[PDB]
Amino acid sequence: GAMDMKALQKELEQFAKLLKQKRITLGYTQADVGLTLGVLFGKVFSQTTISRFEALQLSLKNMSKLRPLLEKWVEEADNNRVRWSLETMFLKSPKPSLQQITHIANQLGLEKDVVRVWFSNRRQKGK
């Protein structure tokens, strides 16, 4: 509820500020932090998601998921054309047949998975 929300919000505004101060006094870039999460858990994050964590522009669910990994980080540190083709199929067949999907994947040198996902992302783009 609302009480759990305000409290979780204040907790992260506060941790994000610690994370920023610690990475700066230790001489790390945002990039370095993302890369070094990768070394210590085998799970890389991009400079971008570190920029968004520190500015509180990720979702509170997203911040909560990432905060433990970052607290562990703090601890250790202290010791086109293809699109054109896909658009024209979308226009003729928005939800495509499984066979059509495979054809266009081998035709454009993609796998099925990418193709089916592309169509889903495009369907959701109607607003």
Partner: protein
């Protein structure tokens, strides 16, 4: 009064090298000095860069102390 961004390793190094390359080639435009400093920096070894990397680290830390509430706010077109 406006708070500038802190100076990254290359830019720290490029200050002193720019001055020396201007002295060696007094007609050279700053535009051309810059291309030459880029090329020289790409060639420096990791050991040769370290003093400049640590100075940039040090200046980022100080930047925070001087300007606790600083956020980089670039102007979009």
């Amino acid at each position: 009064d406006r708070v500038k961004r802190p100076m990254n390793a290359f830019m720290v190094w490029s200050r002193g090298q720019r001055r020396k390359m201007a002295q060696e080639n007094p007609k050279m435009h700053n535009s051309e000095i810059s291309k030459r400093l880029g090329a020289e920096w790409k060639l420096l070894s990791e050991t040769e860069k370290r003093p400049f990397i640590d100075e940039a680290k040090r200046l980022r830390a100080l930047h925070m102390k001087e300007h606790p509430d600083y956020k980089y706010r670039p102007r979009r077109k």
